[PDB]
From a paper:
Connexins form large-pore channels that function either as dodecameric gap junctions or hexameric hemichannels to allow the regulated movement of small molecules and ions across cell membranes. The hemichannel is composed of 6 connexin subunits arranged around a central funnel. Each subunit consists of 4 transmembrane helices (TM1–4), an N-terminal helix, which lines the funnel entrance, a cytoplasmic loop, two extracellular loops, and a short C-terminal tail. Here, we use cryoelectron microscopy (cryo-EM) to determine the structure of human Cx26 gap junctions under increasing levels of PCO2.
Encouraged by this, we therefore collected two further datasets at higher (90 mmHg) and lower (20 mmHg) PCO2 levels. At the higher levels of PCO2, the N-terminal helices fold into the pore such that there is a narrow constriction where all of the N-terminal helices from the six subunits meet. In the respective maps derived from data collected at 55 and 90 mmHg PCO2, the N termini oscillated between a conformation where the helices met together in the core of the funnel and a position where the N termini were less defined in the density but pulled back from the pore. With the 90 mmHg PCO2 dataset, the top class, including 78% of the particles, gave rise to a map where density for the N terminus could be seen to reach into the center of the pore, consistent with the D6 map. Of the structures reported here, the narrowest constriction is observed for the 90 mmHg PCO2 data where the diameter of the pore is approximately 11 Å, slightly narrower than that of the Cx26 crystal structure but much narrower than the pore seen in Cx46/50. Only slight modifications of the side chains would be required to close the channel completely. Comparing this structure with our structure at 90 mmHg PCO2 shows clear differences in this region. Firstly, the trajectory taken by the N terminus into the pore differs slightly in the two structures, giving the constriction at the bottom a slightly different aperture.
Numbering used by the authors:
A (entry chain C), B (entry chain D), C (entry chain E), D (entry chain F), E (entry chain A), F (entry chain B): 4 to 103, 129 to 217
The structure:
Amino acid sequence: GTLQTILGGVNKHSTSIGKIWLTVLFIFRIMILVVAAKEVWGDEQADFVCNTLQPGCKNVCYDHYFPISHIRLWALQLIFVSTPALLVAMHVAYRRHEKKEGSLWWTYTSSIFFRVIFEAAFMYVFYVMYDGFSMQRLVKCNAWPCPNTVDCFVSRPTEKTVFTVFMIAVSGICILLNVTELCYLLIRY
Amino acid sequence: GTLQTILGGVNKHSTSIGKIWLTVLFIFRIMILVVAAKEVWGDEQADFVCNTLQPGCKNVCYDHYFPISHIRLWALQLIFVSTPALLVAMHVAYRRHEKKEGSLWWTYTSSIFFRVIFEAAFMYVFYVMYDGFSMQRLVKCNAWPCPNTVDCFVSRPTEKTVFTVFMIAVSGICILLNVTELCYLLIRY
Amino acid sequence: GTLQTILGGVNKHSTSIGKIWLTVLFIFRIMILVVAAKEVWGDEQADFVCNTLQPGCKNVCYDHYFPISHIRLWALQLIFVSTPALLVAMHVAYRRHEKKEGSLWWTYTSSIFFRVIFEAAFMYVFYVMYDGFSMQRLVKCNAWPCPNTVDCFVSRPTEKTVFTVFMIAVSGICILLNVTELCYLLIRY
Amino acid sequence: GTLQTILGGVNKHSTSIGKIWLTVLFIFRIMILVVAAKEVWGDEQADFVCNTLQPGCKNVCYDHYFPISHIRLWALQLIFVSTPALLVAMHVAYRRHEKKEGSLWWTYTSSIFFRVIFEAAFMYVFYVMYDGFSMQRLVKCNAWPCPNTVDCFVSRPTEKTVFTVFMIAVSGICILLNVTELCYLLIRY
Amino acid sequence: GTLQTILGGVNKHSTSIGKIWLTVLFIFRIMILVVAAKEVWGDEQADFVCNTLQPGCKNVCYDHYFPISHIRLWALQLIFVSTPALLVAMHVAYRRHEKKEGSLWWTYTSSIFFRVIFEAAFMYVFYVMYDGFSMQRLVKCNAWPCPNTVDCFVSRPTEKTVFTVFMIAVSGICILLNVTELCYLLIRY
Amino acid sequence: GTLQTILGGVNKHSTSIGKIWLTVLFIFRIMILVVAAKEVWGDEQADFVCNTLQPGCKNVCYDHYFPISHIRLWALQLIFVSTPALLVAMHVAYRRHEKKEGSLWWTYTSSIFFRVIFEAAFMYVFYVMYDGFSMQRLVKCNAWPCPNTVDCFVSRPTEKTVFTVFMIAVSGICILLNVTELCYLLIRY
């Protein structure tokens, strides 16, 4: 509800690319995460099935191959890339209150520099942690107390792959948009 | 709550067909998806039953025949066909802010051109992926590790067929309405 | 929340019967569906029990006797009978905006004509599909793959019957109120 | 949210007893039903246990002894006793709109007459249907297909009894308050 | 949402202790009950485990030792201690409306007298019903149909004890604050 | 919704560090707890698995090693560290109402002194209760009625460790920010 009012405040005090394309893509990712993707991961552990009679083997194998869920990583990423925009708004509101270019410049050019770092950091984590963007149907697990190697089966691997590729692609576009914003301000000096 | 306020803003700045019929049908599809259809697909995997003792065969057979759920496809389709309208609103708000036909024409005629493409694209995906709009009671699955061929049974196939035909028919009507909007602007030049 | 504001807008621009009795009964049906009836049908398939060892027989028997749930039919009916009122509101708002009897007459008399058709259509569907308004405790099912004939037992048949009779009776009253509205406008010509 | 605004409108246009005590007790019953009582009846059928191996005996015994749940009866009762107050508000709003004692008297004295009837009707139903206000731990069921007589056990019988006595007592107080309101208007003539 | 607006209205028309400390502690208890304590009691019966093969013994033993849940008692207590404040607000609003010390005194001094009674009554009930504020891991049950004496095990006894002590301590503080409010008005006469 | 309005009121009447960094980190912790961390702990007891046939051993072992859940501790911590800010707001509103440095100084310097105490207290509790910030896959339990020593396995130990380190680190930063706020006011005297 009030989030729409927040967007209008953040909509102002930005450049053409920043006003429209960055904000639309940011809302785009939130909608995908909230209304569509969150129920795909609902039964991630409930429907995780292992071919064994060993008690506790299912708990350790799921924890080994999914140290942190994909949706939790995306939730953290959206929070981190949204804070520098929120910090600017409070700084401007604080600045206006005390009133009744250089300071504005350095705050703005720093905020879009942190967003690029955060986007690239989480994008790198997704790759190393899950060795690619495709989820497998079968995982082989040999952690204690599983005897030898145990076959375990993931829930909805194909649908999770579709949303993973979707979220990564949009994040890559947001990186390019922020990079161009730097170039526009770089040549203007 | 605030979504109603959003509709009023989008209600304005449109033509007779665009103001009323496109917006009503768009709200029509959202209501069907939210209040009625979403709980039909709630137990899609929980009540998926296969006649086998092989561990993991249920996971791979459901994933094979339902790579992405119908409700997730409709959620993606509604988001895509709604973005060009949202892009116009921010462009107009940006245009009005800087103020204090050709630009308006090209943005408007392009937005309704993207909606036709997105509607047809998702409509085509529904056909090829699910080979028609009727869901079967029985699916035969022979993917590893299922031994030979295994019979599996879908949950609520008839009710899902009813809502599938309903959503496809409304999407087809929206395509025709957008096509006529092009014709009205085509003859006017 | 905002739905209350919507009602006030729809409350105006109507006749004495239309202003009060039709709108109150419409809110009456929504309240019954939302706060009371929706949790009666919550375990419709989970608590559906069949006396058999055949895998998949439960899925096909429930689908055979309940092609579409009662609550989904009522949700569709309320949406259909509410659209003509919503179409009038946008037409009036569009008409007022362009400003700054015959047109108003034909739109109004048509809207209450569609409501009668939609109410009677869904009322007819409830009868033919479920052969009466009483739900049985026992259903006998012989669809493949059930061997011979299998006894299956419905969940909460009596409570569902009570709400079915309640919703049908209110719909019948709404039909009569709309018919009288036609008679008042018929004699006035 | 907006319900609080609704109360303020209904708070006005009433007498001293009607303004305060009837409205407070009405909010009192809603709070008990919503925040406290509704989760007591959550597992009414899930935790209903019968001592038998007969398939379907649990479904028919629960349906026999609980034709309609207590919380659904209270939800219906609150809706019925609230409509005459809502009808008056629309009548007054309609009356004021056309402007820009006898009519007001008959509408008001009729509304509080319907509330007494509805309160007594539902109170009578609670008694005959459930033969008293105390819920038993054990119910004996001999309906088909249960063999002979089967023992079944109710979930949370004591807590449900506490809330049943609570709701009945408050309803009895509301009857007395409405009766006195008639007496005050009866002597005044 | 609107509850915050309600607090502002109740915040005014009170004394220094009443304006701040009573209202803060009242909000304090609601937050504990809503956001923290309510999910502790979620599986109170689902995870209640008894060492027996007797059908129905689990139902009767849980009902015997938990006639009413702790969270339901706290929900009732908060509603009761909040009504006298709500009654004053409607009385003042009614008084102001008819306008366009003694009456105000007696209403105010009575309201804080009922709050002390309600706080002490529920505090006494918690003690006698549950014989102290510590919940045990093991309960021994011999009610029919349990054979002899059966061992049953409570879910999350330690966490429930922590929140029980927390709620009792805050209630005790609220009693003292109300008592001092009487003393301040007693000496002033 | 209204929480955003609350933040704006709390945003004012603070110092540079207090206005921005403390409030942003406070919102930061709430977002992590609400949208991300709360569903990690959803199946804490449901997926807790012990290698035994002893009834009731699972209940006592979970209760022994998790006397209070991590998310409940964080919920309590956020409530405690937020009350002194809320107390100041009501004091200022009360002060302004009666109007129509020393008092303001002592209230402000005390509020940030309580926040440091509460942050350190809960941080200490997390350490002693859970002997570090890393959660183990395996816990060995010998409480009655478990025979000898029983192996039990925790659900999602790695993901819970990640969020535990995250919440502790942010709390440590908030302690440092409050300490510096004291130093700024200490030198100014």
